[PDB]
């Protein structure tokens, strides 16, 4: 019947745990659609994926696709307003983003479930009638240039483009996808090109319905969603565009057996080994490429990483297939190098080929296939319920590769065992088809080439035929053995019956001097999983720079020691996180509950009886040193955030103090440290998931007893449970701290307007105001003024204190950036005074939905509780309490709030600014003097010379009082 629909797919295979309804289909114009009905979702979502990307960029206008992506948000014939789309989402608790890859342009958004249509309608016009306004084009081109600017000094982007440049230049794979002002404005202007028209042509030529896939999720029934989509998208024209293909691999003969030496920005040592392979996408039912990735990248006993690590040459390894594009792929084996490893690259590669030989000798193993297959089935069946926005985005993308009925299982369920495909791929992993790249500062001054788009310095040499021969003649190494059955594979998935004393929030079931235990049996997700979070309190983890370094090294050495054993647990869906904090240690164990007690016991036992391998100590210590120094290569805005942190926190060691004390840590010193650190402790945990109260108390007591038995751990005094405070800025004061980033040629800035201590009223005043200025800030500071790609605003919360913050990374100097933000602040005051009571009440409603949005999965809900515990506020019913209060606020309250704490002449303005200057900028003032709003005059700021003196001269805020929670 329905002429608008070409076909309605059959039942969409889903997990029996998934309560959501699905319906796949294809419109007459060829758009592949997947509809999802979730009557409980608080936010609805939609996404569209055009199977065309930067690889299709015209040779003379690199980045056009990406620019097209940006421009579609800037207005359509149906909705002309520059930010009609953004403003609509923001006002209805929604959000949106989009990305461009070589073959895809993915657009997505989410919004309050009762406004899907309004949002979808505006969204559909992007693919129907974009305006590509001339004024918007001249401006938006800066955001793109700004985006590329931040990547220029990023080692990942540099290496990503270098591989493209080192392949065949004729192949479209060598194209520069990001684009910048030069390629999108300057250059095209020197060639009489009207970018407006090119955008119109590109959109008209490639944005064809036959190359699109859409996924929508909402509370509406499947029929309602169907009529909705048919009504908004069936009008997209089908121009029958052939799907681009690239059967000829970018790496041909002349590109093989090549060695590349690259100079990195950060001080890192890496070895990259690549093999050109066919496109294995079509073989998703067997995944031969992953089979080899599973083995070659395996950690655990007998693996390649094991030998490479025991020889002290490598620390980490990554192997497997890497995506290329329709027609080609690569198989990689990358590894970080130690100092010794750098001098043994040839030997490392030999081991790689020896292990590969072992695989050819043993032949394809079906039990290995069955194992991964069983794990993937368990993973799919008990997959966590995803958030709409990311879910619609993913589906829209994969609808292009799999049948409607299999779009959910395609990436999980394995069906075919293909020893013939496995051998076929293995036959490509040979010395004569290899590419090797080494990244090291040791190449500095020895290179003779430069990548044009990023300026990467490197050298290219052919691999000497004898080195190739030696690799080709690799024999079996007895140290290399296939993995054995994975004993961590779960088998018990029974969901315990919801106990009688089951509470809505975590309950305190143990309150002793040694430990405080918060517990909650899962009452809504019903999956065989659990979250076990432990907070270990010890003053010796952050007493001084030296101990902080040891706290770090200790845990880093420990994780390096359990790795081999822990890897199996990882593959079996059981992982953990262990790291040092300013208060001691943090341990988290999550995944299937079945075998968690086994991994946990093992970690704590190893923790309290650890024995440091000297060789491992020197290697990891050297890396840590580089890690600290490498902070100099981080982005300007990251530096700004870092400085503000050091400035506002009572106690904080800088990275300079850390590396300085790093030469004082010796093996003897570290060995003494550990027992000291564990001697006296206090543990606060949160056990949440498929577990009983008795299992929880049991797990908590097992941890303590293990520590008590091996480390003689004793309880910590209550007064020893210190919490750091935040510096209390003086009324009407303004301080400025200035620094310089010596790597990036961009400026960074962060402005913090401290308000007051956290509390129900103070929190919502700050949050309502942020909700109201959020979209206007982005639209004003970026879209119109184009200060930079990174323009952020929102609340800052720390040590129980809070306030409004602004973060911007730009080419413009900080003193100018500040002037603009001050100008924006005044624009908002007028804006709030001019908005209707309904518009105001609308933002309240939008903030309410954002705050009440339910977690979809166990770990998400656990995170919320963990936050209440970590901050020691324990306000588990915060969302309902705070929203109720918010619904009470008036426009007058917000106006008074701003006038009292935010305005330039505010009686209680507490302002601190962090100015990060660009590389090529010696000095720069701290203050200074079109169609831009007028910036108010600013007072003379006090320049912070020394951080320590700054804090000493200021008072400290008190800590927030805990919310009441009773139980024995």
């Amino acid at each position: 019947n329905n002429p608008a629909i070409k076909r309605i797919g059959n039942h969409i295979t889903k997990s029996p745990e998934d309560k959501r309804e699905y319906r796949g289909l294809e419109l007459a114009n060829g758009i592949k659609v997947l509809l999802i009905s979730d009557p409980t979702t608080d936010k609805s979502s939609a996404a569209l994926d055009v199977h065309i990307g930067s690889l299709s960029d015209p040779p003379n206008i690199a980045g056009l696709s990406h620019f097209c992506q940006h421009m579609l948000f800037l207005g359509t014939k149906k909705y002309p307003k520059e930010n009609e789309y953004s403003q609509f989402l923001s006002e209805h608790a929604g959000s949106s983003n989009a990305f461009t890859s070589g073959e895809h342009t993915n657009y997505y958004f989410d919004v309050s479930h009762e406004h899907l249509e309004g949002a979808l309608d505006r969204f559909a016009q992007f693919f129907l009638c974009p305006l590509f306004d001339e004024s918007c084009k001249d401006r938006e081109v800066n955001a793109v240039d700004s985006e590329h600017e931040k990547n220029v000094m990023n080692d990942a982007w540099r290496l990503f483009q270098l591989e493209k440049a080192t392949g065949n230049p004729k192949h479209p794979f060598s194209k520069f996808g990001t684009g910048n002002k030069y390629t999108l404005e300057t250059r095209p202007n020197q060639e009489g090109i009207d970018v407006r028209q090119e955008l119109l042509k590109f959109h008209s030529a490639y944005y064809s319905s036959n190359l699109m896939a859409v996924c929508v999720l909402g509370r509406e029934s499947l029929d309602d969603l169907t009529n909705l989509v048919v009504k908004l998208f069936s009008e997209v024209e089908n121009k029958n565009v052939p799907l681009p293909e690239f059967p000829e691999h970018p790496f041909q003969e002349e590109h093989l057996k090549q060695l590349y030496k690259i100079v990195p920005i950060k001080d890192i040592r890496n070895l990259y080994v690549t093999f050109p392979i066919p496109d294995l996408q079509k073989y998703y039912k067997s995944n031969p490429g992953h089979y080899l990735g599973h083995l070659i990248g395996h950690e655990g006993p007998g693996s390649l990483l094991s030998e490479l690590k025991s020889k002290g040459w490598v620390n980490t390894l990554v192997g497997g297939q890497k995506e290329g594009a329709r027609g080609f792929m690569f198989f990689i084996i990358n590894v970080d190098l130690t100092e010794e490893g750098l001098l043994h690259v040839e030997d490392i590669i030999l081991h790689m080929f020896q292990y590969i030989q072992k695989l050819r000798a043993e032949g394809p193993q079906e039990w290995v296939f069955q194992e991964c297959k069983d794990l993937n089935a368990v993973a799919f069946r008990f997959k966590d319920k995803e958030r709409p926005r990311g879910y619609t985005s993913k589906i829209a993308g994969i609808l292009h590769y799999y049948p409607l009925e299999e779009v959910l299982t395609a990436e999980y369920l394995l069906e075919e065992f293909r020893p013939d495909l496995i051998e076929m791929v293995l036959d490509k992993l040979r010395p004569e088809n290899v590419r090797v790249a080494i990244v090291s500062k040791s190449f500095e001054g020895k290179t003779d080439r430069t990548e044009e788009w990023y300026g990467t310095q490197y050298k290219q040499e052919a691999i000497p035929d004898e080195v190739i021969k030696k690799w080709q003649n690799a024999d079996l190494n007895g140290k290399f053995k296939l993995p054995t059955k994975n004993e961590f594979i779960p088998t018990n998935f029974e969901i315990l019956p919801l106990e009688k004393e089951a509470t809505p929030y975590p309950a305190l079931i143990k309150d002793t001097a040694m430990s405080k235990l918060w517990f909650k049996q899962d009452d809504k997700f019903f999956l065989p999983k659990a979250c076990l979070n432990f907070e270990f309190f010890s003053p010796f983890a952050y007493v001084d720079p030296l101990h902080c370094n040891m706290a770090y090294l200790y845990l880093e050495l420990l994780k390096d020691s359990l790795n081999e054993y822990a890897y199996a647990a990882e593959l079996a869906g059981l992982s953990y996180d262990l790291q040092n904090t300013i208060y001691g240690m943090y341990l988290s164990v999550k995944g299937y509950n079945d075998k968690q007690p086994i991994l946990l016991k093992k970690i704590i036992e190893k923790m309290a009886t650890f024995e440091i391998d000297e060789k491992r100590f020197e290697i990891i210590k050297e890396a840590y040193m580089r890690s600290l120094n490498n902070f100099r290569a981080e982005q300007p805005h990251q530096h700004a955030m870092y400085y503000l942190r050091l400035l506002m926190t009572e106690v904080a060691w800088t990275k300079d103090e850390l590396k300085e004390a790093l030469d004082d840590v010796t093996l003897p010193r570290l060995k003494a440290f550990i027992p000291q650190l564990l001697s006296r402790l206090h543990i606060e945990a949160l056990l949440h998931g498929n577990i009983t109260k008795q299992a929880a108390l049991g797990i908590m007591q097992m941890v303590e007893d293990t520590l008590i038995e091996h480390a003689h751990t004793k309880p910590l005094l209550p007064s020893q449970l210190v919490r750091y405070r935040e510096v209390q800025l003086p009324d009407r004061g303004w301080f400025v701290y200035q620094q310089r980033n010596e790597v990036h040629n961009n400026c960074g800035i962060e402005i913090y307007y401290q308000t007051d201590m956290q509390s129900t009223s103070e929190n919502m005043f700050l949050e309502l105001f942020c909700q109201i200025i959020s979209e206007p800030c982005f639209n004003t500071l970026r879209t119109k003024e184009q200060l930079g790609y990174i323009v952020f605003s929102g609340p800052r919360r720390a040590n129980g204190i809070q306030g409004l913050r602004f973060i911007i990374q730009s080419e413009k100097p900080p003193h100018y950036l500040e002037s603009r933000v001050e100008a924006f602040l005044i624009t908002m005051e007028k804006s709030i005074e001019d908005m209707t009571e309904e518009a105001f009440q609308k933002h309240i409603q939008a903030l309410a939905i954002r705050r009440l949005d339910k977690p979809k999965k166990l770990s998400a809900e656990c995170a919320k509780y963990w936050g209440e515990i970590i901050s020691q506020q324990y306000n588990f019913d915060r969302d309902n309490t705070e929203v109720a209060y918010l619904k009470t606020l008036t426009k007058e309250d917000i106006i008074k709030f701003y006038k009292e704490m935010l305005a330039v002449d505010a009686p209680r303005r507490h302002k601190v600014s962090v100015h990060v200057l660009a590389r090529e900028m010696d000095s720069c003032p701290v203050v200074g003097e079109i169609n831009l709003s007028q910036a108010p005059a600013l007072p003379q700021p006090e320049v912070i010379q020394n951080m320590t003196e700054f804090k000493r001269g200021l008072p400290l805020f008190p800590l927030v009082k805990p919310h009441i929670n009773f139980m024995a």
Binding site: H66, Q69, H70, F73, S96, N97, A98, F99, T100, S101, H104, V144, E147, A156, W157, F160, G177, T178, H290, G293, H294, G297, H298, E299, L317, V318, G319, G320, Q321, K322, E323, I332, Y567, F778, Y789, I790, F792, G794
Partner: peptide
């Protein structure tokens, strides 16, 4: 580890709020 478990690099409209 398996690459399958890894940061493909694409260009996003907006930076991450996280």
């Amino acid at each position: 580890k398996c690459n399958t478990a890894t940061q493909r690099l694409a260009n996003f409209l907006v930076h991450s709020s996280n």
